[PDB]
Amino acid sequence: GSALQDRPIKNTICLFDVDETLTPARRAVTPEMLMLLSQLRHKCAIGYVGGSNLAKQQEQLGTGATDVTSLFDFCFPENGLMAFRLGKPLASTSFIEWIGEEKYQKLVNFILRYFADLQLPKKRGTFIEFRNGMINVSPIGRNASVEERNEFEAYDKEHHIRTDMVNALKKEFPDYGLTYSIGGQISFDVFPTGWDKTYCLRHVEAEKEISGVEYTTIHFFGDKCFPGGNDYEIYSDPRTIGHSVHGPEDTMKQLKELFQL
Amino acid sequence: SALQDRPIKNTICLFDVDETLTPARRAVTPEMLMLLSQLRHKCAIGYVGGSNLAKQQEQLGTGATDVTSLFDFCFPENGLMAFRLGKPLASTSFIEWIGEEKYQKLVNFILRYFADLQLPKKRGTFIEFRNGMINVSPIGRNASVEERNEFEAYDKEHHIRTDMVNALKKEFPDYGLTYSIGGQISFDVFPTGWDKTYCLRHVEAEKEISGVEYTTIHFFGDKCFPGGNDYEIYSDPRTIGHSVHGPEDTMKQLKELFQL
């Protein structure tokens, strides 16, 4: 393949969300999408940005013969808190490093006590999941079954469990510099302000000092581009040309129109 | 093929999974699968493991092969879940046994205890809710491999796990729970008798289905010493227990056992 400075469509990168953008919901990428990405990659820079860790993208996008980092110019697991450029790791930080062990424990202890005191129809397990760039917090717990999650969602619609807990956290930890995002049925995310998918754009911008390539056309594709979705900020950011997709078929259609492919 | 047609009559082999059939939380080898399939032409085979089905599916199956196709009996969660020739068997669960209200008393106490607990490190996944138990970790299961090693050494010195088990026994003295401290970072909490011997009810019930009465029940496990989670099923007079150091040792003993 070609170096980034040799791609013919100058100053241009396409960044993709993984789940329901490059891959069907809860499946691996198709060969047709891989073929289209490789064609796109002869024209401009490509990358992905996803919430989950590298291992997850390796399952969804890579194989036993192919490391996912070989398939994209830029890989941004964990919203870009982890990053790869042409297979090489970029320097990174983590949530626990940024907040520190002691403050992290204050946060966790508060959350555990809050959940012990919270009255709910059902409690299960996996109330806090620790990830590299955030925690995920669930009052019922992620071990809730499919049907328990449906029931919690409806209960939460009525009782505002997540909203009241977010507000309680903001009041307990007012100088912690955290953002709270309620998503899906049973949980909300907690991370340092700015550690949404826009975080990855720093790596794209830093390319200027490596190859000299200045990415002024930054296409972003995502399926949760509405307020409150995980793609909302990166979609809305004036640095990107945002493209909202319903799924991978829609992604392919838009890409083919966008680049005459 | 039908259980009543296996030539070695009245005989079943039951295997622990982690460090018996596979390396702990890693994939079965092709040689082991081949040996299991050969064994399966002679007698009934099954596995019994503490973890849920999804774990056994990742260690023993593939995208093309459902783990339930590979064994006559599958007993995830010590047999609180059960499959016979790919079909789910009727079961109970921990939440059914204890009920929501007492479960919340238990979980609230655990959560409050952890909120008060001082440790070098906390992560996530302090309580894991399963069908046959809860698993309780003061550092949390999201602890990395290295953090788990470090916690284990810390716990050896500071008795974090032991003191919390004692605290639970003090708070819930009539709950009919058993506590087992195992591995690096956690302990299990489950109704007394919901150890691996629980699965033997399914083996015994086969008499009313196919008519096969399992009088030779081989069991293979790597934690057959007092306190290990294979101890009860190993020691039970219904089984011929076989203690293994790992999957290589399992293969060696099986080959001797059955001329394979």
Ligand SMILES: [Cl-]
């Ligand atoms: Cl938890």
Ligand SMILES: [Mg+2]
């Ligand atoms: Mg998505």
Ligand SMILES: [Mg+2]
């Ligand atoms: Mg074992």
